[PDB]
Amino acid sequence: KKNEIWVGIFLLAALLAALFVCLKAANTEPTYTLYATFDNIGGLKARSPVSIGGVVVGRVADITLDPKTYLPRVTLEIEQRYNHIPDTSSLSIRTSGLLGEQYLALNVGFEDPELGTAILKDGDTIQDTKSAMVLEDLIGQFLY
Template structure:
């Protein structure tokens, strides 16, 4: 009788653990977006999408309004083309809006930040329709490029383009070493 009771407890514990694992999987994958929510398509082309991937959120002010559905390479100019599924509730996006690849925190996931533009039909603006394209995009910042720019700026001081060996010195700047020492060029 004792073994049967312990088997029931083990079975109940395993069932509870299985339910917890299923709950966590659904929570992590944000499965609520697979429900009966209708969406519409938006497209955007970037120079660099960084670590953006299908399923990444599209946010306005931190609120998720859609998801990245696909990332392809444009056959004409070889730029990444991102397609997004936007919730039908948010179908009033002006064509003057901009889209930027951002990162949540220092090492967090990448997402698309949508900055809503203005809508003024007198100025020729319009509301994006299903299949529309956002023209104003800002690519992902590459950490290596930022570090390189920082190191380049700190290494050169204030001189952006140092003069070449044969250039005449600009007033206020020292002459290049090779111009002062003709023996060094030989």
């Protein structure tokens, strides 16, 4: 009757346009890549909060040990509008709890050198690893 042939297709269009909105916000921005060599990632899973000052700035999407130097090489996801960060930084894993998520909370400051301000973008391998949280050597230390 030429009506729901016209209307009813828009009614299924109105749900899918409503469906496409919500699942988009249920699982987004151009970033660059920043490598990082560590020594130890205990409970550091994928999609963990990469945070600066506690404020999350990125995720970990690459968790594949480089199988020739046996240092854990992890590439981070730092957004493309992060272009004003000097090379003085340190990479540390905190937890936000006794067992929260074991998240990367890397520190950074504006300690500019007298040689020039190096930048960190588009594929830099920072070497300021922490090697702290093992929690089994430390309880072995006191008993001695």
